[PDB]
Amino acid sequence: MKYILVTGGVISGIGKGIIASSVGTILKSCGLHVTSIKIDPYINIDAGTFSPYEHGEVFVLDDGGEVDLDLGNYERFLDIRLTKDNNLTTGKIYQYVINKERKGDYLGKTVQVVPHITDAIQEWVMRQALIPVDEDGLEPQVCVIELGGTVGDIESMPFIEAFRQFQFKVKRENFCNIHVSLVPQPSSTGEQKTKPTQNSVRELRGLGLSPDLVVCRCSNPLDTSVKEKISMFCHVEPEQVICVHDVSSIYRVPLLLEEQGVVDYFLRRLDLPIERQPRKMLMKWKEMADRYDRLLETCSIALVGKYTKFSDSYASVIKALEHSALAINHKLEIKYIDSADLEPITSQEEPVRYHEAWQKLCSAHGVLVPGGFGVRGTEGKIQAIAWARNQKKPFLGVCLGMQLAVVEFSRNVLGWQDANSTEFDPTTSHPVVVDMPEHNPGQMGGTMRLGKRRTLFQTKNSVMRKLYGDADYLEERHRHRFEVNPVWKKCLEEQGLKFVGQDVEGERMEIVELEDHPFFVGVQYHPEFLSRPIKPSPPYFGLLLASVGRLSHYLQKGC
Amino acid sequence: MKYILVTGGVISGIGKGIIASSVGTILKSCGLHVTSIKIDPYINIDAGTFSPYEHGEVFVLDDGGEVDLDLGNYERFLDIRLTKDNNLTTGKIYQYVINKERKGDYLGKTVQVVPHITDAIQEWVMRQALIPVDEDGLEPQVCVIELGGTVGDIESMPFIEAFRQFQFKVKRENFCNIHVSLVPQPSSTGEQKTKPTQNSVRELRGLGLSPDLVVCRCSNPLDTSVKEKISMFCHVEPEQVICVHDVSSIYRVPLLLEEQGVVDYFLRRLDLPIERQPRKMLMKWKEMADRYDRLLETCSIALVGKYTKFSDSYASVIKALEHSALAINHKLEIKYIDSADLEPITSQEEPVRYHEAWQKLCSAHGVLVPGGFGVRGTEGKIQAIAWARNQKKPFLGVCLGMQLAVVEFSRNVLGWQDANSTEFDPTTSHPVVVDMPEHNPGQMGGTMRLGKRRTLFQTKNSVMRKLYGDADYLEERHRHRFEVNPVWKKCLEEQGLKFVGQDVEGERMEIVELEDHPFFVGVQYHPEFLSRPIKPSPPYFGLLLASVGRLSHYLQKGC
Amino acid sequence: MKYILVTGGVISGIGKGIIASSVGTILKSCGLHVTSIKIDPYINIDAGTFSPYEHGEVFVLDDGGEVDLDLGNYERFLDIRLTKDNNLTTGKIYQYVINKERKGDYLGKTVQVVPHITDAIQEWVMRQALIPVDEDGLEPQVCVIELGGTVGDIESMPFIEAFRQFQFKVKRENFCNIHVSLVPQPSSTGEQKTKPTQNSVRELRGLGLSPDLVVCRCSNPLDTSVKEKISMFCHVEPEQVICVHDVSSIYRVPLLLEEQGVVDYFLRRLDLPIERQPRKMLMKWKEMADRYDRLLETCSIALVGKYTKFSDSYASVIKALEHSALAINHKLEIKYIDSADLEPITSQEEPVRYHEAWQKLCSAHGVLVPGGFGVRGTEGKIQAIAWARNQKKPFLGVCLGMQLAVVEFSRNVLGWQDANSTEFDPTTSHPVVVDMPEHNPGQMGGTMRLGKRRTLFQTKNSVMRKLYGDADYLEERHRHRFEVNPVWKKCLEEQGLKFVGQDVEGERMEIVELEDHPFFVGVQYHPEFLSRPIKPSPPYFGLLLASVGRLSHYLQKGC
Numbered sequence A, B, C: 001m002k003y004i005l006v007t008g009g010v011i012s013g014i015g016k017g018i019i020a021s022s023v024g025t026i027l028k029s030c031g032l033h034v035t036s037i038k039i040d041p042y043i044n045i046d047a048g049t050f051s052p053y054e055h056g057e058v059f060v061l062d063d064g065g066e067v068d069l070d071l072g073n074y075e076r077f078l079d080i081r082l083t084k085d086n087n088l089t090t091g092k093i094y095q096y097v098i099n100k101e102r103k104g105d106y107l108g109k110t111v112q113v114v115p116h117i118t119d120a121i122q123e124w125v126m127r128q129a130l131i132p133v134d135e136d137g138l139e140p141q142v143c144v145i146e147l148g149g150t151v152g153d154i155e156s157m158p159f160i161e162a163f164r165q166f167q168f169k170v171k172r173e174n175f176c177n178i179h180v181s182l183v184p185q186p187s188s189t190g191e192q193k194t195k196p197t198q199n200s201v202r203e204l205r206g207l208g209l210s211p212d213l214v215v216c217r218c219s220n221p222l223d224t225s226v227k228e229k230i231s232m233f234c235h236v237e238p239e240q241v242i243c244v245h246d247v248s249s250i251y252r253v254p255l256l257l258e259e260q261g262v263v264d265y266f267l268r269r270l271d272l273p274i275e276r277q278p279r280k281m282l283m284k285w286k287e288m289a290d291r292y293d294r295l296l297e298t299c300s301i302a303l304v305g306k307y308t309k310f311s312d313s314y315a316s317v318i319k320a321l322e323h324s325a326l327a328i329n330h331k332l333e334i335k336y337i338d339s340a341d342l343e344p345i346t347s348q349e350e351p352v353r354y355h356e357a358w359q360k361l362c363s364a365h366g367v368l369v370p371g372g373f374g375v376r377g378t379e380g381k382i383q384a385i386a387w388a389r390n391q392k393k394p395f396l397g398v399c400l401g402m403q404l405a406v407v408e409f410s411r412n413v414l415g416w417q418d419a420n421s422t423e424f425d426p427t428t429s430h431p432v433v434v435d436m437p438e439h440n441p442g443q444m445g446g447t448m449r450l451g452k453r454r455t456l457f458q459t460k461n462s463v464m465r466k467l468y469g470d471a472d473y474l475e476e477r478h479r480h481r482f483e484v485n486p487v488w489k490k491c492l493e494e495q496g497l498k499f500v501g502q503d504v505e506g507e508r509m510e511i512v513e514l515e516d517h518p519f520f521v522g523v524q525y526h527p528e529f530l531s532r533p534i535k536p537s538p539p540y541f542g543l544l545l546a547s548v549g550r551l552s553h554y555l556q557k558g559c
């Protein structure tokens, strides 16, 4: 097992996972069984408890793992399947060791970071090193380890030691130190600064680790003299000084790395053979790059929500949209409309924003009301929903959005204006949205429905079914707790609000398709987790097609 | 609450708890409600799982706390009663916080050392600060905190930060930084070295903490020039340079501190009033010191055991003996006889040691076979027991020793040579010593009997009862799992091996007194934990008296 | 060039130079051209300005270098000749670089520790690496570098970096990291502590350097378990855990190292061939060891002086005496008599010490009044001199001692009681001792006579000449400024105080031999610098012989 450790300093968000994913797919192209471990210094356990605004999506793994999106990124770049084993936290380690302490596995003796924790860490490395993450049940040939934190963080120091020694328990050629750093560049001077890197690297080498390659997050490319300075300061080859300038899109990075020839370095460094044609794929990334460079019209989508204030909370969602944009080869605008700005409260506060938001909403080609948390903006959200329904604008609701859509329907079609979600109003005359958690044995209380679950189609006459390919069933990511009250579903069955998808029990509703509407659907499950550039998920692709006014032709053409 | 933090560097065993206990009792003399917190960096929880050879006694608290002996030392120096709350480990903190993490008390967000752990730490400080440790249910006036670890240990860094900030949340005068350091002195040069202290203090001040007083563990007293150098290096007053030279006995330290006038410093530093006569007790420590200086004959005791290889495993046991030695005003020799050296295996290996051990054993005035762990030396232990019984030498057995004594009796009196302990021989024809754990509800499996429990006397005609003062019952420390098989007890009732003490249920045996023997008793409970210089426990005092051949006169004289 | 870097931590006086000298001579025995560099972190330059009480002797090199005695130790252990080039200070480096800065050698640009100073350092390494220190004018094969300071001292950090990188500019096998540490052992516990070493080594490995061998200054030998612990903590072989316990004499260390087999390690580590018989000398150190173990009577010498308060100020002086003691095979007591204690001031202050000092003086077999600085004790010094002269006790005076002896003679023989040294009394009626410095061109003012200079014999009838071997001249170390006033010399020529040695000019007096005295001589030059175990200098050997009352037989026997 090659152990490529990805470290970094100066600031989070430097792009360690970006490089990791880029190299990972490169190594897969090379023909290696690539696996990876994300080590989160985190004291806590279970990313699923973290806020999506605070951090972003919690990628759901096949095993219902609630992990960081970067692992989903890895699953975008590599077909590999990851499990909870692939994401460790110190909280996890704590409980683990503490348990063993209670067990007397340490003879009741105190355990210390060294040797005991660092040993456990190394054990973990092997525990996952030995797990194949492919159909090929073979110990992967290379493991890329995203070590979170930055150099200097106490949270990561235990691992610095673990790895410091570890790299010597394994052979030199079986361990690679990648260090990502930052070349900041003030706008006031435009001078590319290396000192921060010098600081990080110096500290790292103080710690005892010495990068084999140093990735430099650069704005624009570095000039020679800078590279030469770095070379001297770090005592590394200018080859090893890797400038990765900012790219308009991530897809350019693998190509950049190719330009850099980092692969050849790895071949020499890790002593790896390679059979090749162009060194690596090439037409894969090359064609896509050509397509990315050669795009028509910009289709805009109104992201309506709370956490919608720009953040990367929707990075995989937009990426899913990008998958569709690439397929169709059109350009994509993401509008960020705070649903709150759609409310009359805003009209009262700043009607500029109020009317601006609605102006933007109308100017959008399609709308998306994703899931979210909090009562905030519910009104504006529903207003947007009703607007789209009335205006026959392509509407996709996800989770909360679907839930609210049903409520909206009840209110403005069944006249049940007091229909509501029990999530926010326990005194609801028509409890449309009701808390329906899972009650598995061994659990105290209910639990949120989460994981890859099977959804069954209730009918053949379903647009989504057609988009899926006439499948009898589909399996999707789930993450949601409230469900349709069947007490009112039955009052919605004579209505043109048709429920198409159901859980296996036939109880929880997963897909709804409003009849007599160019495109108005809602899903509970989360397809953006499974959408891939090659196989885009269909509710976003279909939404795009509707946003364009292509969809009917598409299906007519042959789907 | 005054928060006197005791820190230290260079090496463990520097004597932080020694100083803490000395100051503590001083502060009590001053008239303060003194309390204390022992912070053990320990990753583990529950000292009761640790080896007594590795560390030493696990002091049992009133609440069955299994803690470090230093807290017992504190209870020797102060009447105060400590609970488990008074001893924290990081293992404890881990689980605590982790639980709250699971509870979502942190909103599911990651927690970090700062602020979250350091806050928890400060909380803990208050949690215990608010607990009185006297009959006076009043928040103690001063808390001395023994912070374990040494400066530089990552294990303690979280607390360095907690306290760094904490001392500013409290007032200056409400926090005192005590730093204990080391003045080593090579024998090859005899030069007193200050650099190690300079290093520790420098690092500490780097960390952000600045000692108000620096205790210097010195061999011989420092000379002026050294003190002056330190003064300059640390930028502290030579008053603040406290030389605590090595003393023949701990009892001299409070007096040393008096000579140093550290109390007056505290009065000025912490802004504490003091009413006084001699500043502090004085005749308490003064008289004892006079007695310690004015001691007759040296009575020797044969410590027979495993862990008996010199260690401080028996520090409170010897101290208990010292309590008796002081009462009687005689001198005390502790012989350390590896029970293994009493075995014919040793005769085969090195008969010098073999015969030397037995020579020493005979030369001893009394013998002690304490509890212990491991099958090792059991033979030599039993041989010593039989020897003492035959020779009518004062014998005290504790726990294991008592257990083995009963077996020995059975073997060489009842002829049940295959009598044995099931602890080591599951195939025993006469299971004398049998596993009899407690089975409390909520526990899986049995548990060791531990804690302050009540023992009832089975008879008035008991030497120990007389020594106790004709009490109907006694309450003692317990720590033991195997008990007398009642199947054979009944065969021991017609024998002169009389069982005097029993648990409340009347099942487990705690005291045995061999009849027709100057002194041959065994106890399961552990009285050395409760013995005090003022009130020495009677099985050690009585043993001493027997070792002397005073006991009969003593009782005759009036007990 | 092999670059064996000797580092160390915890405390100065750990014995780095001791090990360096031991290994050095071993490597010479192996057959290597051994050289060495002593790097003193010292901000100052020229050890000759430092106090002999503060540090000790300033070894004078052939080139008049004023350096640390350890280099003389190296010249005791190895025949090699060292020059000023072999001792560098940071003060030296400062001025050197600053000069080049002024020269514009850096283009007027700022220079920094890195790269500029660390480069200069590496340059220095080569500057001396290229200098042979043997008759063989060949680049030495191995350079042992005594890096002064301890790990953690900022004074040495620049060199840590220089070497960190340097060891990679040279090959692995061309660089060896020796780290000397300390295993302290409290007398209160007797527990050998490893943590301090763990701290030092950890820090060192933090810095980026990793010992190939760790010398452990131990009191008694370490036991296995300790070594095994260290092995784990440092991740080094127990071979690499070198315990060097305290030895009664330094000469035992090379033998210890042999027992350890460190040489074989070096052979494997540095990839050095070795032709051998016993691996190394053996009978050299073995015979001496046998002689050291097999010594007759203890001859005592009264060291009379100021700085005489025990210090190692006289380490090479006593060592010179040891050379003689070994030759004669007798035992040696060094009495340390503060000359001040010989004065009536002391009689007034503490006559116990007064009479004790004189009692000791009489009990001494011979007396030594060496050079020294300061008016203090001059009276007691002279009193001792007159005492020895009257009592016909073997007297050797050096520098100041010789000077005072002449004054004493004048006072109590010529009656010139006001005769004095102008060094301390400018109002002297008979200026015996006068300031006679050298006035070399290019110097402002005079300078102290220093360096290896030639002294000529004024006569054949000289005991010292005979001891030297009838040499027409001798060359010795010089270090002294005041000389005999020739105005009174001429009044001493008709006296029995005969001046035997003179400088080449025939002006400054170097040797005086009192006639009609078993042994009363004085020298200005400093022979203890040139005395060797094999070739002991004769004024100490002769003094010993006189102290014994063997000298006449010796010469009679054949010298």
Ligand SMILES: Nc1ncnc2c1ncn2[C@@H]1O[C@H](COP(=O)(O)OP(=O)(O)OP(=O)(O)O)[C@@H](O)[C@H]1O
Pocket (backbone or CB within 6 Å): A008, A012, A013, A014, A015, A016, A017, A018, A070, A244, A245, A246, A247, A248, A249, A250, A253, A312
């Ligand atoms: N070369 C690059 N060009 C453009 N954007 C980049 C580049 N590298 C990283 N980014 C962006 O930086 C942001 C941070 O990415 P990422 O999360 O993977 O970094 P990280 O260092 O692994 O910190 P974390 O995993 O906690 O978010 C993303 O928005 C990503 O698109």
Ligand SMILES: Nc1ncnc2c1ncn2[C@@H]1O[C@H](COP(=O)(O)OP(=O)(O)OP(=O)(O)O)[C@@H](O)[C@H]1O
Pocket (backbone or CB within 6 Å): B008, B012, B013, B014, B015, B016, B017, B018, B070, B244, B245, B246, B247, B248, B249, B250, B253, B312, C188, C189
């Ligand atoms: N001034 C002193 N004179 C003599 N012995 C001393 C002195 N100070 C401490 N000691 C001894 O040092 C040893 C270590 O004591 P102690 O355990 O209290 O130290 P500590 O620094 O608190 O480390 P720990 O609590 O882990 O044992 C004991 O054997 C004690 O008797």
Ligand SMILES: Nc1ncnc2c1ncn2[C@@H]1O[C@H](COP(=O)(O)OP(=O)(O)OP(=O)(O)O)[C@@H](O)[C@H]1O
Pocket (backbone or CB within 6 Å): B188, B189, C008, C012, C013, C014, C015, C016, C017, C018, C070, C244, C245, C246, C247, C248, C249, C250, C253, C312
């Ligand atoms: N193994 C040893 N046994 C006995 N004495 C020793 C041993 N090692 C060193 N010493 C003694 O330690 C003292 C310090 O020696 P030395 O000066 O060479 O050490 P150093 O670490 O090189 O510090 P410095 O050069 O500044 O004096 C000397 O008195 C020496 O005799």
Ligand SMILES: O=c1ccn([C@@H]2O[C@H](COP(=O)(O)OP(=O)(O)OP(=O)(O)O)[C@@H](O)[C@H]2O)c(=O)[nH]1
Pocket (backbone or CB within 6 Å): A192, A193, A194, A195, A196, A198, C110, C112
């Ligand atoms: O007022 C000041 C500010 C800074 N300095 C000096 O500036 C120097 C830092 O110099 P630089 O910032 O130029 O560092 P660098 O060449 O290694 O890399 P970049 O900055 O291009 O990223 C340091 O050597 C410091 O002494 C001053 O001397 N005075």
Ligand SMILES: O=c1ccn([C@@H]2O[C@H](COP(=O)(O)OP(=O)(O)OP(=O)(O)O)[C@@H](O)[C@H]2O)c(=O)[nH]1
Pocket (backbone or CB within 6 Å): B192, B193, B194, B195, B196, B198, C012, C039, C040, C041, C042, C146, C147, C148, C149, C150, C155
């Ligand atoms: O070979 C050596 C060893 C040591 N040193 C120099 O020794 C100095 C350490 O000097 P000291 O050990 O004397 O430190 P200190 O006066 O602060 O306290 P104590 O030692 O008495 O506890 C440092 O300044 C270092 O440069 C050398 O220059 N060369």
Ligand SMILES: O=c1ccn([C@@H]2O[C@H](COP(=O)(O)OP(=O)(O)OP(=O)(O)O)[C@@H](O)[C@H]2O)c(=O)[nH]1
Pocket (backbone or CB within 6 Å): A110, A112, B012, B039, B040, B041, B042, B146, B147, B148, B149, B150, B155, C192, C193, C194, C195, C196, C198
């Ligand atoms: O009161 C205290 C003092 C110390 N400690 C704990 O003591 C431990 C230090 O333990 P040791 O001193 O035994 O360290 P070591 O085994 O590495 O080597 P030597 O000491 O034999 O040289 C640390 O892990 C610290 O947490 C406490 O927990 N509490």
